[PDB]
From a paper:
In the current model, the E3 Ub ligase [name] recognizes these polyubiquitylated proteins and then ubiquitylates histone H2A, which serves as a recruitment signal for 53BP114–19. Recognition of ubiquitylated products by [name] relies on three distinct UBDs: MIU (motif interacting with Ub) 1, MIU2 and UMI (Ub-interacting motif [UIM]- and MIU-related UBD). Currently, it is postulated that [name] and UDM2 interact with different ubiquitylated targets: [name] is associated with RNF8-dependent polyubiquitylated targets, whereas UDM2 recognizes [name]-dependent monoubiquitylated targets. In [name] and UDM2ΔC, the simultaneous interactions with Ubdist and Ubprox provide the specificity for K63 chains.
To confirm the specific interaction between [name] LRM1–UMI and K63 chains and understand its underlying structural mechanism, we determined the crystal structures of [name] [name] in complex with K63-Ub2 in three distinct crystal forms. One of the three forms is totally different from the other two forms: two [name] molecules and two K63-Ub2 molecules are assembled into a tetrameric complex, where Ubdist and Ubprox of K63-Ub2 interact with two distinct [name] molecules (1130 Å2 buried surface area averaged over the two tetrameric complexes in the asymmetric unit). This tetrameric assembly (theoretical molar mass of 54 kDa) is inconsistent with the molar mass of the [name] [name]–K63-Ub2 complex (27 kDa) determined experimentally by size-exclusion chromatography coupled with multi-angle light scattering (SEC-MALS). Therefore, we concluded that this crystal form is an artifact generated during crystallization.
Author numbering:
A (entry chain D): 1 to 75
B (entry chain A): 111 to 191
C (entry chain B): 1 to 76
The structure:
């Protein structure tokens, strides 16, 4: 299935995921597409900070859902 | 023969039955189809309204997620400066 | 006695019933004949939805009368 990851810069990343994929896998898929290391990623959905261990279904993340990504800013 | 004496008493009632039945059949059908039409239209509209409530509730959730992300971004980047 | 059930697309189901049978039995007969689960079924006569526990006799449903079948949405 598909989900979306919107960065604070406006950019929208599209990912192919399974409901059993963990947040660690999601960060790995964002790393492949955008080169951002998973340590420098924090994902927010439904007013919550997602934990690397739990899966997408754990957070009731269904298809076409939109996650928000927080990055590291070495200004 | 019995239908001959019974004829005068019953023939007018029986010669009009088929029309009386068709009248009641049509009146039943007209009341049911009018009710059904209201049923389908009211059901379809309310289903559309519910799906549009869920759409706006998801959008309200993305806006709050974005502002939470924006606060977390400022907090955690100020810390590790 | 025989009654007729008009569906939403115009079809007619034919049922053998008794004035004593309840709306439940009618829906069960519609299931046996058309494979439609009774919980999906809404039966309308004379402009009112019919309640599972009342009888055809309670609703003045006589021989060769026509009931109207409207299924429920999958969700909703």
């Amino acid at each position: 299935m598909q989900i979306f990851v919107k960065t604070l810069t406006g950019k929208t990343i599209t990912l192919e995921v399974e409901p059993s994929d963990t947040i660690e896998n999601v960060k790995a898929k964002i790393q492949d597409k955008e080169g951002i290391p998973p340590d420098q990623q924090r994902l927010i959905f439904a007013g919550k900070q997602l934990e690397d261990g739990r899966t997408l279904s754990d957070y009731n993340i269904q298809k076409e859902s939109t996650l928000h990504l927080v990055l590291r800013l070495r200004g | 023969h019995m239908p001959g004496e019974l004829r005068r008493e019953y023939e007018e009632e029986i010669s009009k039955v088929a029309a009386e039945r068709r009248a009641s059949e049509e009146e039943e059908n007209k009341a049911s189809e009018e009710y059904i039409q209201r049923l389908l239209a009211e059901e379809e509209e309310e289903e559309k309204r519910q799906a549009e409530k869920r759409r706006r509730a998801m959008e309200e959730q993305l806006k709050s997620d974005e502002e939470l992300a924006r606060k977390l971004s400022i907090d955690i980047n100020n810390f590790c400066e």
